[model samples]
Target: ASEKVGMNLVTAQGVGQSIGTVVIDETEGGLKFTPHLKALPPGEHGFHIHANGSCQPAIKDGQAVAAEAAGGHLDPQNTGKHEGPEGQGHLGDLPVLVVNNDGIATEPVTAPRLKSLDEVKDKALMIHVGGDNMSDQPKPLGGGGTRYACGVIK
Candidate 1:
């Protein structure tokens, strides 16, 4: 049976200022990211599934990423092992989120096959400082320093 997941709260910091209270809805097709940022940076923000389910400090230690902590990109098949949707890397490889001038995005995108509400109970949704090239070039964080915002799925 299909289940539903609700957002607790989202907080981010580091590179730029701090923003929080972003809500998300898990729709049939995908998820609805409703950000309340006005006049955002207007660029691609790295989005992924964080291993830990807690959103304590908004801006975490800013340390390197560990698969266990960051969980995996919603990839159930475990194929390709590369980044980006094109690559078989992970299923949670959502495209960069582009915020317009007003800073409102009601983007409805698909969720990974393995993105079950129960699976992400304690997990978190993280937004990186920089963009995700979909490659593990420099490292797991992909040079995207700082945890801009994170929200727990309940």
Candidate 2:
């Protein structure tokens, strides 16, 4: 199946508003995400599919954290690792979301490991604050930091 999921900026308050849309299509190779986004920070950002379909903020360490309700990256296999899209860790590790100098993302990123709609039919697609090295060592989850933008895939 195919969907055009709307992207939104998430904060501790809630899903504030929309930034744009991402066309997610189940292709022969994998799930492809064609981004038509704007108003994002320039450069590459860590993008992945979260376990939940909600972008609501949740309490973490007694503070209203950003998008914690979205949950961790989709790891249905229970690998509990962040080995990236090419790695065999979790299915949620999608390719990076690259934004240009104008704070826009017009590129297409794909997840070869996620070749069907069964795994990501209802999940939260996240764009993190910084880049992702796609590993668990050096820093957990590539130290992607906070969730800058989120889109719930239904």
Candidate 3:
């Protein structure tokens, strides 16, 4: 049997509404990430599974933050590195979510590190403000910037 899960991506501030849906399917080879997102810019966006399952905002440095409760990347092995989706680093790393000029993600991305939906059963799916280079060298967290959108995996 195959394992499947769906997540409704919402604004991290908890004020904005749902912008998209991500369906995760555990396939024979790996995990297939099918996303239908809207209201984003045209370009590549960093995508990953966060370590927490909450999308709650928090107050930090006298300012309200977005998705602060999600914690860092899903580094169960404590690799503490950004080595792309197929690298020997964080398992939460996934392929970039490509958005068209119309502000929609039309195609699906895949990740070979994920073998089952259980790996992220209670985690959070996150989209960063910028694109990812799949390496920590040039930019931190693959230059993903701030947490733009998030969804709790149920």
Question: Using TM-score as the measure, which candidate wins?
Answer: 2
Models ranked on lDDT: 2, 3, 1
lDDT per residue (tens digit) for residues 1-113 in model 2? 68888888987888888878889888888888899989988888887888888988877677888777778877667555665445567667666789999998888767786
The alpha-carbon lDDT assigned to residue 80 of candidate 1 equals 38
Using lDDT as the measure, the top candidate is 2
Sort order, TM-score high to low: 2, 3, 1
What stretches of model 3 exceed 4 Å from their correct place? 1-12, 77-79, 85-88, 134-139
lDDT value, residue 19 of candidate 1: 47
lDDT of 1 by residue, 85-150 (tens): 455566555555556656544454454444346655666676666666645565554656454555
Per-model TM-score versus the true fold: 0.58, 0.86, 0.81
Clash-forming residue pairs, model 3:
none
> What does candidate 3's lDDT look like per residue over 40-70, in tens digits?
8778788878888877777767777666677
Instruction: Give the whole-model CA lDDT for all candidates, comma-separated.
Output: 0.52, 0.79, 0.71
